[PDB]
């Protein structure tokens, strides 16, 4: 069993692309990623020190990347601080258990 509480995981459109465009800046220079050129097909969400969003987005035609966009409130300073994510995978990029 794994904690977290991934809320859901429905289809994703450019609305997840914003959550994706909001973290791809930090995600770009975090793991030298890039995002933005990927299509988010679905997403989920969790509740912790604020609110995060997990996304099942792909970056080609045989690979997926799960990002972890996180928003706070009690320490706004962070706000949409995607501190978790994964890219270039085709075996452990399922939902959030990636």
| Residue that has been written with the tokens 């679905």 in this structure | 42
CB within 8 Å of 11: residues ≥ 6 apart = 41, 42
**Helix (H), strand (E) at residue 81:** none
Q: How many Cβ atoms are within 10 Å of 14's Cβ, its own excluded?
A: 10
List the one residue out of 35, 80, 32 whose CA is nearest residue 60: 35
At 76, list the tokens. Answer: 């706004």
Query: Which of helix, strand or coil describes residue 15?
Result: helix
Domain containing 7: what range?
1-98
List the one residue out of 61, 51, 63, 60 whose CA is nearest residue 22: 51
Q: How was this structure determined?
A: NMR
What's the full length of the chain, in residues? Answer: 98
Q: What is the distance between the alpha carbons of residues 87 and 97, in angstroms, rounded to a whole number?
A: 13
In Å, what is the CA distance from 90 to each residue of 4, 57, 86?
22, 12, 11
Count of structural domains within the chain: 1
CATH number, residue 70: 3.10.450.10
């Amino acid at each position: 069993m794994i904690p977290g509480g991934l809320s859901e995981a429905k289809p994703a459109t450019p609305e997840i692309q914003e959550i994706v465009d909001k973290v791809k800046s930090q995600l770009e220079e975090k793991t030298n990623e890039t995002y933005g050129k990927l299509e988010a097909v679905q997403y989920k969400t969790q509740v912790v020190a604020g609110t995060n969003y997990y996304i099942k987005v792909r970056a080609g035609d045989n690979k997926y990347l799960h990002l972890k966009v996180f928003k706070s409130l009690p320490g706004q300073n962070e706000d949409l601080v995607l501190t978790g994510y994964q890219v270039d995978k085709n075996k452990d990029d399922e939902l959030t258990g990636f």
